[PDB]
Subunit: 160 residues, 3 copies
Amino acid sequence: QIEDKIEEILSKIYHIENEIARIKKLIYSLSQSVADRLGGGASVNSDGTVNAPLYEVGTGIYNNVGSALSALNTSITNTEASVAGLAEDALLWDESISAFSASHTGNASKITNLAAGTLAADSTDAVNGSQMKQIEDKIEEILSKIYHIENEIARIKKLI
Amino acid sequence: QIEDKIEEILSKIYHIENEIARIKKLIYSLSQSVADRLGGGASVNSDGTVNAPLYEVGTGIYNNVGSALSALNTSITNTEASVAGLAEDALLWDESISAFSASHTGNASKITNLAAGTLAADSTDAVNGSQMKQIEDKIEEILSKIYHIENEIARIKKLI
Amino acid sequence: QIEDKIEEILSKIYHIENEIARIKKLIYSLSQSVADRLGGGASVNSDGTVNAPLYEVGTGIYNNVGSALSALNTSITNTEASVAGLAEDALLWDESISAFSASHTGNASKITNLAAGTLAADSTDAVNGSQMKQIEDKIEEILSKIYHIENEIARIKKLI
């Protein structure tokens, strides 16, 4: 049973060598598939490791998934900060009062840098201070003409 | 020392077979753990590779991490573009002047499609062109009555 | 050829043991590289598996890439929802009419909580209902003075 024992040792060694060649190929296949699922140019190195992906987020490049996710989180944070800024400063429709509200930090506020509205019976343009001042000037002139009328009348009222 | 040498060859072969069965199981365990850390339904294929994850971002499905990160970057980009649009077009509080500003691209601008404000001593409603026109009409009528008064007065002024 | 056959069996076994030690080290190197490319503190466990990353997105922690991507998708969704809210409610520049528009859901709308505008010949401040009411009161007083003038005139008109 000695030459027989050698015969089978050589055959079992042959099966082991086949397993090793199959295992070596399983490892690079695994490695390749992982590189594929990472994307961003991840590839398999000559030594069997997965070379780093290159992920572009914003103006930066990230060599791992966590750093990219973090960068996306920060971008969304910054965009939310801009949105909250707009929301604090925008002249907004207020549903509770059915109107746009020029309230700011609890106070009625001005609107300024407003160009003059068309004055017509069907104009829906807002009007400004310059336009109302011209009306106020007309009114003051009307009152002076009236005071002149009251005096001219008074003179003839006594002179009779 | 010949049968002894066989005895140990069979024992060393037995240790190698145990190592191979342990290595085969290490590879599928590694593979499984990688599938778990990727998520998105990644699983281990019969051949030992990691099947692709399916990541939903927006209206698309992405089969690798890089393509998903890219898609998230583009969504945030698009949302920032909407925000910048709002910021260019919104009627905004200007802290430097303590007031909302109807400035647009450096010019005083109109506000139009404005419904008529309540006219009362405590109204904080904006007023429109139609409302100011009605005032201007009243003023023109007042001036004609005054001119009629000046003439009636003049007639009696000479006729004495 | 029997002792020779043993000589080479021991040498082929020696090459196989070297391959196994090289393969064991390839697996932990692969594992390490995958842990590195995942980031978020992913590390290699004693058993050769990749321990889970810890990815922070918003106020949550996610133990796999898919769940993190999902969380980033939901955050961007929520930020877009805020932006669309602003866009529906903001008083906006309308390029088609070259003016800010106080239109809301197809209707001319009020602006209220507006503080009084400066009345001067170069004021670009919007004016409110309280300011226009004071003008209307002045006008009513002017008309009563005129009616008094018409009566005083009429009396002297007949009395001659």
